[PDB]
Assembly symmetry: D2
Homo-oligomer: 324 residues x 4
């Protein structure tokens, strides 16, 4: 605990200037209320939610009797859906996914960052449960009809559906047919996602750089006018540090990459530590555990107080609210 | 009035109370403020291109021909000398603002809505360019989907020529996406449109692609001098529109558009406090709507009941 | 004019090479007194509101009638208006005498079909989706807007606003074949106006193409007023070679037949 | 299978047969495969030597970070080779196809056509579509290196397949028209190939029965599973498998191709 805090402090001390600016921008978005988190399958995996490769394993087992490229993960479920019936597909979905998993500390960290919205490709209810505990309400939008009747300002937008209505293959985007016809079947969901991206600060966590959703979003981003949008942040938590060529390639595509493997040293399978490094860096930046010199203190107090120079007198009971 | 008209009024006023009402303001509202109409600009373009003076496509093609032939500089000059005028804001602008809309989407490239918002005291993030979407200072937008002349009276800042409309989706992806998201997430009232407008039919075409019941039907304030034909009304209401006809509500002269707009706008405003209660069944329904959530609680303080009924 | 002379030279060259394809519009059918679409819209408006037009109305009013009055009445009106036999005007004979490799027409009538049957040149008539695969001959009489061969129903023809809106989805093979024929042949437009819907959509599709990757199609204009030089240069910069029959000779304000005949027989005598 | 051969031979006699030749036949001709090109780009990128999108992303990353000059230099030093035409090219020509559609950017099919004496209008760029002077077409949908060993002349990396319709509208339209108006036999293609998936996606847009079901020659070492076979029959492909016809070695692709090509030829 204390050793981890000291190590985080040290890591921030030798942190690269680019990463420091990225952290400062993310924290400024969090304070401004304009921060949106784009949570992927990795964060759900940190709570041991059933990954999709096991589902493709079962589909291959029922298809050919024996137990994967990028196309296979979408085609083999489609093979099951076409060759067999929809009922078998939904039954496999039900047996694999009707589990109650806990919320990992990364969920708590994401909701502690005060996200305006949480977009996610996860069909699980882990993020909804995490928001439910913390006392902040998120309007969960996982189907088309949910877009029109959104109760609150904050959305938990599950762009690939979920199983709230039921553990059926028509409620979620799993097979290859779903991805081919996603724009036709989810106009409102895709439009809301793109509007949230355009109007907010986006941080991708739990995603690989070569994931289908990341590539699709970067393909949409290329169509936008130059400098008309803000580059989303991408928290990369792969075991190995990002290659310089891949880093510059993806940053020229409109991403600000914070690579967890570059910030800290960790084991190959210590994914939770890699996620926690970046999330804790962000939070202790928000919690001001990293300011040490008299210059940073003056700047922090000035940023809190300088607007109040507009007023003549400020109640001492108000100064408590000023400093949170 | 008619029962369905009263239902439309109830829906609009409920959305206004909930802060989920968005006004889609067209060229008709600006025209009542004497802002130059686009047919005069096409007349000038035809005067320069040909000897002397159209179809719906001509209103876009003639400026396109003027551009392609005479030059962006000449197009800029005519736009500047026609649109660089100061016009007062209508009482309809103030009525729309008094409805307290969440957003004001508009195809008007003038600042009449901007001037009305500034005068009345409403702060809206004016989004007229692509870069304005990310730089919006608030969550309430004045979304000029066709641009405006804030940067300058240039033809590149607005959607006027034919090429502008063909390449709109390519040139305004963020603005179009934001407009469609606002339509999906809010209650939309169309004012200043002729039910045959290009923008209205494009929005109805996009609405066709949506799911059967995933969206709320936008409202359309029709202020044409003659009452809508029944067949036209069925056709447009089956396309996803809920039409409130100004001509059906009140009788007025053909050219007296101000009273036609004001009838519907004042009927909406004066209905904000109205509860539409005449029969005992309506009384019971309203009191039940106020009280039924309190059935969860075991007891309610009597001094708290003044807040239940506002 | 030198440009005009080079034009007829190049259509004659394409016709001799067998790479000439003719694009037929509504004017050619109207020249034989075929029921025009404006009167169909007038009848739809009279059955809608009882008292009888912009560019949008021509597609909307049939769609309003289709939606509110159903499709049986739409098909009945189409049958009672289009179930007529009309003689082929000499323009059809002159078009076929030009030896076109393909005849792409937006007309839903069979006038080109009977003209080809009389002239003895067999054209594979492709007007439906299934007609593309089972094409008997290489020469295509391509009715991109369908026809009434299957029956006088609105589902077989592209008339209403919905049909134009969903044309690419409903007619992917027909549109693909027509674009291919335009790309790999020399296209001559007759029976069309400069403001025609299909002409401007084709100009948009051409603008989507790579510059200097296509042959500029020929547009033959029979509008009574001579083509304005500004409009002429605007449409030539858009990828058209305009031959104005009104500029070629002087004629009355209602004699379209001689106007078409001037360009057609000038092309023939050049051949 | 017997019925499948009858349709192919009948359409070959009618003269409307078209062959969609993939990278498999070029590999049989020992042409430099794209996987070694991706390996070379990776080595010049990271320094140490694959996913489906990797074959497209890695050349794209190299093009973005190194530039067009290095990309074209690697292309030239890896592709400027002379490879003899395999007998499968001769067999395909002996089937007398109306058109030859190839995703290959080599001149192997062109050299085979020149050797056999058949005139095919080679189209690999936009300008070639309009200026074609023959009814027969050799449609290189992905381009080739006749203009030069440049990356712009070919569709190799990502942002070339992404913008394929934008930069090749005429070529794609001609390909689709030929597919619709002719019968198609796929050779040298895998069932999970990107181009096969794209063409099946386009075919799914077409209404039922409006198109002739394309023929797919499968030459993988293992026999097709019945479930995958039936899935791709439903998708629209009529599959004839070389592995099921004869017993063949794992790496002996030439005899697998021949077991279909010679059988088709002798059934004329």
């Amino acid at each position: 605990s204390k050793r981890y805090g000291e190590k985080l402090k040290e890591v921030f001390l030798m942190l690269d200037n680019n990463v420091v600016e990225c952290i400062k921008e993310i924290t400024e978005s969090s304070r401004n209320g304009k921060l949106v988190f784009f949570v992927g399958a990795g964060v759900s995996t940190l709570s041991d939610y059933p990954q999709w490769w096991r589902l493709v394993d079962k589909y291959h087992e029922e298809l050919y009797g024996s137990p994967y490229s990028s196309d296979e993960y979408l085609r083999i479920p489609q093979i099951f859906y076409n060759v067999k019936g929809e009922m078998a597909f939904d039954g496999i979905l039900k047996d694999f996914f009707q589990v109650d998993k806990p919320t990992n500390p990364i969920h708590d960290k994401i909701l502690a960052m005060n996200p305006a919205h949480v977009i996610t490709t996860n069909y699980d209810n882990l993020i909804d449960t995490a928001c439910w505990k913390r006392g902040k309400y998120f309007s969960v939008i996982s189907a088309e009809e949910d877009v029109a009747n959104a109760t609150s300002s904050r959305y938990l937008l599950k762009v690939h559906g979920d199983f709230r209505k039921g553990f059926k293959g028509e409620n979620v985007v799993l097979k290859e047919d779903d991805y081919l016809n996603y724009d036709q079947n989810y106009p409102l969901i895709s439009n809301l996602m793109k509007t949230i991206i355009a109007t907010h600060t986006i941080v991708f966590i739990g995603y690989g750089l070569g994931d289908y959703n990341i590539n699709m979003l970067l393909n949409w981003v290329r169509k936008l006018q130059k400098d008309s949008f803000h580059k989303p942040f991408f928290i990369r938590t792969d075991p190995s540090p990002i290659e310089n060529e891949t880093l510059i390639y993806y940053e020229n595509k409109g991403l600000r990459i914070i690579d967890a493997a570059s910030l800290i040293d960790s084991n190959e399978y210590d994914y939770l530590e890699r996620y926690s490094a970046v999330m804790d860096l962000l939070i202790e930046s928000q919690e001001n555990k990293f300011i040490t010199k008299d210059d940073e203190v003056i700047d922090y107090i000035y940023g809190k107080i300088s607007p109040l120079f507009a007023l003549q007198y400020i109640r001492k009971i108000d100064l408590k609210h000023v400093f949170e």
